[PDB]
Amino acid sequence: GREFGHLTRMRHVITYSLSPFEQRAFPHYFTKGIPNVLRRTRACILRVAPPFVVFYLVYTWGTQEFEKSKRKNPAAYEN
Amino acid sequence: TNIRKSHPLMKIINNAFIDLPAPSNISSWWNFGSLLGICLILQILTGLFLAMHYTSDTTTAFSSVTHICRDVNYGWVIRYLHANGASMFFICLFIHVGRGLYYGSYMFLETWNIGVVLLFTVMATAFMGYVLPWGQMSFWGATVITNLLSAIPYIGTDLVEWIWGGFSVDKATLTRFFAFHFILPFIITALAAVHLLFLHETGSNNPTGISSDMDKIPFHPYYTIKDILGALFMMLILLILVLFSPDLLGDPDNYTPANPLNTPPHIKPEWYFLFAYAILRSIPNKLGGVLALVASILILILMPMLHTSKQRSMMFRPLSQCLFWMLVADLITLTWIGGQPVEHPFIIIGQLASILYFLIILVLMPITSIIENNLLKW
Amino acid sequence: AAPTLTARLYSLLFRRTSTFALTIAVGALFFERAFDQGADAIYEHINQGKLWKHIKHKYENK
Amino acid sequence: TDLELHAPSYPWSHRGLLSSLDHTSIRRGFQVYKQVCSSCHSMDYVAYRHLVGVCYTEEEAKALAEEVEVQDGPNEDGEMFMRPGKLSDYFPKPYPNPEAARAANNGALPPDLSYIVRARHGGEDYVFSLLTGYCEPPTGVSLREGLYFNPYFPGQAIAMAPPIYNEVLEFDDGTPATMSQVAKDVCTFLRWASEPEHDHRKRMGLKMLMMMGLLLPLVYAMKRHKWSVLKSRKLAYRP
Amino acid sequence: DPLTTVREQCEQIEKCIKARERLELCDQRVSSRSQTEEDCTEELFDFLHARDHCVAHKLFNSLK
Numbered sequence: 001g002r003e004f005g006h007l008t009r010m011r012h013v014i015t016y017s018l019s020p021f022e023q024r025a026f027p028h029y030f031t032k033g034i035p036n037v038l039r040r041t042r043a044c045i046l047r048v049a050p051p052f053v054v055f056y057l058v059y060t061w062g063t064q065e066f067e068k069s070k071r072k073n074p075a076a077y078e079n
Numbered sequence: 080t081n082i083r084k085s086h087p088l089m090k091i092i093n094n095a096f097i098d099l100p101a102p103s104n105i106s107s108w109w110n111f112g113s114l115l116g117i118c119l120i121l122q123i124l125t126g127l128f129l130a131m132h133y134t135s136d137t138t139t140a141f142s143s144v145t146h147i148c149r150d151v152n153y154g155w156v157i158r159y160l161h162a163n164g165a166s167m168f169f170i171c172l173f174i175h176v177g178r179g180l181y182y183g184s185y186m187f188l189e190t191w192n193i194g195v196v197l198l199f200t201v202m203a204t205a206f207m208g209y210v211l212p213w214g215q216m217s218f219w220g221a222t223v224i225t226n227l228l229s230a231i232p233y234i235g236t237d238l239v240e241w242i243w244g245g246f247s248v249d250k251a252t253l254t255r256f257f258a259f260h261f262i263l264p265f266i267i268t269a270l271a272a273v274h275l276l277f278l279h280e281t282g283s284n285n286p287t288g289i290s291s292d293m294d295k296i297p298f299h300p301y302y303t304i305k306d307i308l309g310a311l312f313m314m315l316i317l318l319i320l321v322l323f324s325p326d327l328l329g330d331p332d333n334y335t336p337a338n339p340l341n342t343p344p345h346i347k348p349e350w351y352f353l354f355a356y357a358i359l360r361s362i363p364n365k366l367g368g369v370l371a372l373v374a375s376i377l378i379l380i381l382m383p384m385l386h387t388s389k390q391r392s393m394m395f396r397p398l399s400q401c402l403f404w405m406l407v408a409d410l411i412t413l414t415w416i417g418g419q420p421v422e423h424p425f426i427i428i429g430q431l432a433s434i435l436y437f438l439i440i441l442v443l444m445p446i447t448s449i450i451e452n453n454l455l456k457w
Numbered sequence: 458a459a460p461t462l463t464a465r466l467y468s469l470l471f472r473r474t475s476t477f478a479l480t481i482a483v484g485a486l487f488f489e490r491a492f493d494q495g496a497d498a499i500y501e502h503i504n505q506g507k508l509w510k511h512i513k514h515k516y517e518n519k
Numbered sequence: 520t521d522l523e524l525h526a527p528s529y530p531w532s533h534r535g536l537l538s539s540l541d542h543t544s545i546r547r548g549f550q551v552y553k554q555v556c557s558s559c560h561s562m563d564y565v566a567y568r569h570l571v572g573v574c575y576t577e578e579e580a581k582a583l584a585e586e587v588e589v590q591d592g593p594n595e596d597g598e599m600f601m602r603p604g605k606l607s608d609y610f611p612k613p614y615p616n617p618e619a620a621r622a623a624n625n626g627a628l629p630p631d632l633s634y635i636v637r638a639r640h641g642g643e644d645y646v647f648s649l650l651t652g653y654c655e656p657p658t659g660v661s662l663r664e665g666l667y668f669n670p671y672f673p674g675q676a677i678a679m680a681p682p683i684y685n686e687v688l689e690f691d692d693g694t695p696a697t698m699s700q701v702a703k704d705v706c707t708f709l710r711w712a713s714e715p716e717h718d719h720r721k722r723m724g725l726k727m728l729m730m731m732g733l734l735l736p737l738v739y740a741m742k743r744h745k746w747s748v749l750k751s752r753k754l755a756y757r758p
Numbered sequence: 759d760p761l762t763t764v765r766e767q768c769e770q771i772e773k774c775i776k777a778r779e780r781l782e783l784c785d786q787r788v789s790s791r792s793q794t795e796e797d798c799t800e801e802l803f804d805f806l807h808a809r810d811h812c813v814a815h816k817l818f819n820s821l822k
């Protein structure tokens with residue numbers, strides 16, 4: 001029901017484009033690419049990283065109170 | 080005559096895959112729908128090979144699986160494709176559901192509700208197949224489910240002595256486990272066709288949440304080449320597991336044959352059932368355990384009416400994104416706890432994380448979206 | 458404006474689209490000639506004196 | 520039931536991503552199977568046919584199946600008769616039924632060895648540390664009438680006498696048959712017995728990794744060619 | 759024979775004499791009172807862990 005000549009109504013916008021054979025394959029790869037992924041990462045990590053830092057501190061405490069109870073008892077084996 | 084537009088079969092292919100209008104800013108999180116369809120076809124063809132040499136009898140079930148890995152030609156590669164292809168299915172399925180939850184795709188109501196049905200049917204299928212080899216996890220996995228399935232108040236004990244053939248454990252026992260496991264993947268296929276028929280009425284969502292009818296591109300060639308590339312990158316990772324570490328995800332205890340006499344040192348399911356197992360063992364009851372296991376998949380169907388934000392996706396909502404990855408880091412906690420023994424530190428951590436899974440979805444998320452509406456003045 | 462050697466095959470065969478879909482068949486040849494020189498020979502070189510056909514000359518002396 | 524001792528990691532020569540099994544250490548490990556065990560342990564899934572091209576030729580394999588005669592089935596003008604090995608025979612079992620096996624071995628049943636490294640949490644690191652880890656009981660523990668102290672076994676008390684010591688057998692290679700040499704060879708054999716596809720597995724994994732190294736960077740360049748139309752587009756708005 | 763060589767040379771390390779110290783410090787203390795449930799199967803494990811970690815790094819050179 002929704003094909004290309006029936007989607008919206010749009011006025012006064014213009015598009016310019018080049019052929020794929022008139023373009024070189026890598027305009028930039030490492031001079032554009034490295035600073036763009038360094039700011040996409042700065043925007044991410046203070047939303048994503050702090051929940052996984054709290055799982056790490058629970059894993060480290062939980063696998064340290066199991067070993068102190070599975071018979072590491074020198075002074076907890078008194079008459 | 081354009082024959083792509085006038086032939087009765089070629090019209091359907093052209094409207095569904097070639098001339099389909101698609102958003103231009105679709106990410107690679109939208110790759111995992113066709114990856115799920117590749118993983119389903121792979122499990123069907125490989126499973127139809129194993130079913131010509133398997134024997135469903137509790138005296139010769141374990142011995143017919145060792146025979147195909149040693150005697151039948153290319154039986155060892157096809158068996159470990161099947162076991163590792165099922166882990167591949169469940170990792171793509173959890174990415175797929177988490178995508179639709181973060182971007183707000185559950186607003187396609189008929190597409191979301193067929194999806195929650197498909198999630199139950201693949202979880203029940205994978206349970207039946209892990210009973211069929213009959214080692215010491217197929218035994219102590221089957222009995223833990225079916226004494227938990229005798230705690231249904233009025234028809235419970237009627238249903239437990241139906242699936243074993245009527246007896247306790249015998250030859251005719253795994254004919255019913257095998258016949259369910261044969262049939263359910265072909266119903267999953269029919270439900271996935273209806274799934275895409277309802278999505279064809281609106282087209283796709285996009286990472287901004289905003290409608291994109293002024294910026295469509297055709298599906299061919301832009302997403303036919305992007306989906307082929309993601310499928311090749313998935314067949315690479317699967318074969319790294321089959322050919323360089325085929326026993327990494329399994330357990331060694333399933334290479335001992337089932338014995339009601341001997342004793343297994345621990346009870347550990349597959350990694351993708353370990354989160355549900357941790358919610359079970361936190362409820363000291365056997366009716367309230369099977370209820371809270373079924374309510375952890377069925378809470379997905381309340382996501383359309385719990386939505387109180389003015390915007391559709393989480394791209395522009397920074398407080399809802401801290402709660403989304405608190406929920407992912409809580410399903411990692413429940414996977415670790417489900418593979419630990421039941422002693423003191425892992426018993427309070429396990430039940431304080433079963434509470435947090437329901438407190439985030441039902442209470443903390445709808446209140447946080449209202450605070451965000453008020454800081455933007457709607 | 459001396460260009461680089463891109464257009465070896467743009468004009469003759471890969472223009473009529475014939476050899477574009479034929480290179481899966483016509484172009485199926487001589488790379489299982491060329492990659493025994495790889496994988497097989499790298500395999501017996503990492504494992505030297507450890508395989509059967511290395512050591513089988515001892516009991517094969519009839 | 521307090522804490523376990525977990526086996527250390529040894530540098531086996533098949534612990535690489537492309538490293539094969541040593542096929543002379545398999546050959547010396549079958550002979551420690553067939554002179555030291557084979558008497559308390561079974562190996563139900565391996566036949567004499569499985570050793571042709573691995574550590575023996577076909578002759579040297581018929582002539583080893585000859586060495587024990589077997590109990591064939593019924594025929595007319597006779598009985599269930601007897602006959603030497605046919606090279607299609609599995610390795611001959613060592614206890615009439617499961618019940619004789621208990622009384623011959625202090626109530627404990629000795630396990631089948633066809634899947635033993637695959638069915639242990641630690642593999643051949645566990646089997647090596649078991650056979651060379653027998654020691655004396657510490658002061659405080661007592662044991663039963665026939666029951667021995669082994670610290671790397673679930674609950675130190677094993678119902679198994681130490682089965683290998685110095686010069687238990689003689690290898691037909693001139694290799695000195697000390698205690699550590701013979702334990703190293705029944706870990707290599709019994710890794711082959713569990714995983715007989717080990718070497719074929721790692722050689723298909725290299726013929727996949729370099730015929731994907733042709734196919735992947737060239738579907739990626741086809742993708743980047745189509746999408747450059749959209750990545751270079753410019754937009755203007757003129758109301 | 760190569761094992762008894764290696765196992766003795768690595769038994770004089772700052773972790774394995776430090777474990778032998780507490781071991782016979784407690785070995786002497788169990789046998790006195792004859793109604794006691796105290797073992798030292800613990801104490802043996804701290805020594806065998808420290809020792810067997812160093813045997814594995816050195817033993818496979820001397821074999822085959």
Ligand code: HEC
Pocket residue numbers: 551552555556558559560624627628629630635646649650672673676677678679680682705
């Ligand atoms: C004459 C008796 C006897 C011989 C010979 C013997 N064993 Fe054992 N072994 C046993 C008994 C009995 C058990 C069961 C132990 C138990 O349950 O305590 C056992 C168990 C084992 C186990 C399993 C331990 C576990 O965790 O289940 C391994 C591995 C093993 N033996 C290795 C060997 C190897 C390798 C050889 C010879 C090359 C060997 N054994 C020879 C008596 C023997």
Ligand code: HEM
Pocket residue numbers: 108109110111112113115116119175176179182184185187190191194195197198267271274275278282283284285379
């Ligand atoms: C075997 C199972 C499934 C298959 C084969 C499958 C297949 C697909 C495919 C091919 C798409 C279109 C492409 C894409 O966006 O990735 C899609 C979209 C979608 N699926 Fe699934 N799916 C399955 C399970 C599920 C589940 C379990 C859910 C949710 C509970 C779900 C919900 C959705 C939604 C909401 C969309 C539209 C998303 C959007 O456009 O933003 N599906 N599915």
Ligand code: HEM
Pocket residue numbers: 119122123126127129130133144158161162165168201204205208209210211212260261264
């Ligand atoms: C969504 C599809 C499927 C999933 C997730 C799935 C999952 C599984 C799993 C996890 C096992 C246990 C294997 C092991 O760990 O050893 C198994 C076994 C088995 N499956 Fe499947 N399966 C699927 C489809 C099928 C189909 C369609 C068939 C048959 C037509 C099939 C036939 C078998 C057989 C015969 C076995 C027993 C042999 C063996 O254990 O290897 N499977 N399946």
Ligand SMILES: Cc1cc(C)c2nc(SCc3c(C)cccc3-n3nnn(C)c3=O)sc2c1
Pocket residue numbers: 095096101109112113275278279282283302303306307
């Ligand atoms: C390689 C390959 C081939 C095929 C044939 C293929 N087919 C699909 S399903 C197309 C679809 C339908 C039918 C209906 C509604 C929406 C979408 N759709 N829209 N966007 N995306 C990402 C979608 O999948 S993926 C895929 C990948």
Ligand SMILES: Cc1cc(C)c2nc(SCc3c(C)cccc3-n3nnn(C)c3=O)sc2c1
Pocket residue numbers: 199202203205206207209210216219220221223224346347348349350352355356
């Ligand atoms: C919807 C649904 C249905 C079922 C039936 C279900 N069952 C589980 S846990 C089963 C289990 C146990 C308790 C112990 C050992 C092994 C296995 N087990 N069985 N199959 N697989 C792949 C396993 O890991 S969650 C779940 C969710």
